[PDB]
């Protein structure tokens, strides 16, 4: 499979999540995603084919994971935006007030702005601390997907937010959305990964 930020993948033939970013760890290919999407050793599938397994994750507390892929997968420095693509150029962290977009299998590519950092989400499983908050909308299934600026600086992966009864927070105003992402920087250093860029 071609690995692009934002596409769907399933875990153990049950849950769906979105790919965050293509990365490498020495000769190993992988992608970063949300920790809540899978447990260590869970199987990831793209379009019904096995592409790899969860190599590590932290959830709750943090919400991060990386999936190690088989050698036949093609890593690309890109994030899906409809039929188009955003090129990944690095991981400079943007500040509060910056515009950012996110990509995922449920709501597609949505943009907004960063409104706060260091937010705590109180999920049913336990608190997840240090998340950054944006006001781009998102829906169930978007988890693990990319958060990136239009300039190509990868920001983090989708964690969660105030989903309404229709499964997303797209039908409420930007001012009332809380869409939280886990910062990419600490995931790359915790697992020794390097981002694929173009």
């Amino acid at each position: 499979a071609n690995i692009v930020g934002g596409i769907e993948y399933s875990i153990n033939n049950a849950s769906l999540c979105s790919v965050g970013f293509s990365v490498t760890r020495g000769a190993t290919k992988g992608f970063v995603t949300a920790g809540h999407c899978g447990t260590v050793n869970a199987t990831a599938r793209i379009g019904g084919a096995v592409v790899g397994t969860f190599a590590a994750r932290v959830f709750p507390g943090n919400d991060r994971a990386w999936v190690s892929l088989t050698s036949a997968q093609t890593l690309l420095p890109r994030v899906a935006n409809g039929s188009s693509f955003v090129t990944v150029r690095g991981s400079t962290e943007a500040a509060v007030g910056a515009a950012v977009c996110r990509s995922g299998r449920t709501t597609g590519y949505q943009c907004g702005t960063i409104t706060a950092k260091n937010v705590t989400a109180n999920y049913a499983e336990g608190a997840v601390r240090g998340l950054t908050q944006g006001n781009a909308c998102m829906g169930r299934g978007d988890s693990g997907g990319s958060w990136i600026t239009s300039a190509g600086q990868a920001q983090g992966v989708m964690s969660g937010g105030n989903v309404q009864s229709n499964g997303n927070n797209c039908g409420i105003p930007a001012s009332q959305r809380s869409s939280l992402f886990e910062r990419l920087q600490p995931i790359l250093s915790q697992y020794g990964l390097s981002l694929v860029t173009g």
């Binding site: 949300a34 809540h36 919400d63 989400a121 109180n122 999920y123 049913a124 499983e125 998102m138 829906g139 169930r140 299934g141 978007d142 988890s143 989708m158 964690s159 969660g160 937010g161 105030n162 989903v163 809380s178 939280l180």
Partner: peptide
């Protein structure tokens, strides 16, 4: 908030 809920995970996703």
């Amino acid at each position: 908030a809920a995970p996703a």
